[PDB]
Amino acid sequence: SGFRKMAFPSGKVEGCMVQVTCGTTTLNGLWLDDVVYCPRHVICTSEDMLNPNYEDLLIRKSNHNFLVQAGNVQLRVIGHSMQNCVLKLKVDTANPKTPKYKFVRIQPGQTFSVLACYNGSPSGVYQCAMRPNFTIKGSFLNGSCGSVGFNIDYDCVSFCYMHHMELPTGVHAGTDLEGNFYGPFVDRQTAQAAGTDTTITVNVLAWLYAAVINGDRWFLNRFTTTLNDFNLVAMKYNYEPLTQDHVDILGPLSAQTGIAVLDMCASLKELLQNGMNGRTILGSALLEDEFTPFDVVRQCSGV
């Protein structure tokens, strides 16, 4: 029993973190086989942060402009190239700790574990969700760029995020490991801001099922609702529409608890319209939306 925001064990990723320096800028790199991946903005000066032509800046760089340190071992860069907003630094040594891995891009509403790093050394690990507006609500200080987000399936690491920047609202923006940004953000200095966010309805329902599995039942009721009547209420409260695919995805949790999905939707409608009246669910006074149905099943296996 119990339900916590749980990250994947970080060991396999810790073995891939290195330190990358160019000029006076130091950040983190990801060392897989004989390539080190890092944010391309490592090559910029703050004389260049305004309208950097990254192509121009990179043609002016050489292999020896990049210092890569793995612990207290210097790796020799023997090649460099740009892949969208990430740099690929070919080094003379394959990482002996390379796990089985994939580069996957995730969807808004999906979760992943972040290994926050500074100077190539891991600091902590926590769980994030990709928001509908393609930001993440993380914990990142200067020097954290190049920290990565990931999921593990059996013992294959699916890397899905590399950290690049913080927005004025305090949320965070980055790329997949092919260097393609999540969302309409750019690695150049603008007034860029997060677009309007919404609540991930299917996740809130998943977390309500987690609560039932863990013995929190006070929000349940007799009522059921139609999918269309629910979505009418969800729209009003800045919740994403619930699709029939979402209903299908919640099937296993519905079966385990004996609570039909549209029954739980009726509980959610009442929570949205009346609040909790000073009660809590799984220790929270807010409806939580950063647990996927998978996060719930994986953690609530046998309560």
Add this chain to the structure above:
Amino acid sequence: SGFRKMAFPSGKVEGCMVQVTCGTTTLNGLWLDDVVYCPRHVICTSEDMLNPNYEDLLIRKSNHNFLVQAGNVQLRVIGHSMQNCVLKLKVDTANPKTPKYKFVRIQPGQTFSVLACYNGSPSGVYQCAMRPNFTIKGSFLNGSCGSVGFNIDYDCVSFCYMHHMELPTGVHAGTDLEGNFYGPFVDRQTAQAAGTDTTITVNVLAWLYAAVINGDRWFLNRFTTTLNDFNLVAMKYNYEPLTQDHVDILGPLSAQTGIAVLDMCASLKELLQNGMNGRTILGSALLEDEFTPFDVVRQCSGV
């Protein structure tokens, strides 16, 4: 910027987890040097869960009654002994992945990272606090016994918790790594229940400072309070008394924000008496008490 419940990187501990079987019971063990540590209740049958004499049960056991598997490598047990509520199984091989480590017992109000494991294999990592009533609010299913809690300082792992059981309220109980329980709990089947808990006041104040550092300021006010007038209110709301040592410990966060500790106490008194009126702090609608002053400083270094 940003503030998250952050765990320590788990790599150093993942390398120490093994699987321990005795009879039909399998749980997790911690493999350090040539010793494997696990809960002594591994030797019990459910014919014995009522009033086990652990001394009696252990004298009837032999080395070959204990199967220890490290990945897909069998370790030979060459010695066994009881240390309070933990078993020490001497094995024929020192763990080559043994980190620098300490066995430390923590205080209520302190935090640590838990590496949840099943069958010797890590599942996830999350942060816990030791509650004033010596329980922890974790996420543990059957098979998780022997999972450990820990902190890291530089690259020394201070193990502080081994998991033994779940209470009827859904909270969790265990021992330090010397086998001594936290709290008045026993590894035998009783009606044992958690005593009454309280809120960790110094941690709530630390988290309010974290919020200010991260730009949440709406709860601040002009008022200051005396320590005694604050503690009068804290008592009324099931908060622990604030000591002058607590005030001193909050010094660095007070200096960084320019907000005197007794000023923040006045904010807390008002929050306790009036609630938040539908606002949130660092994403929470409740006052959070599972971040220590250290957790805040370490994470909010340079905002």
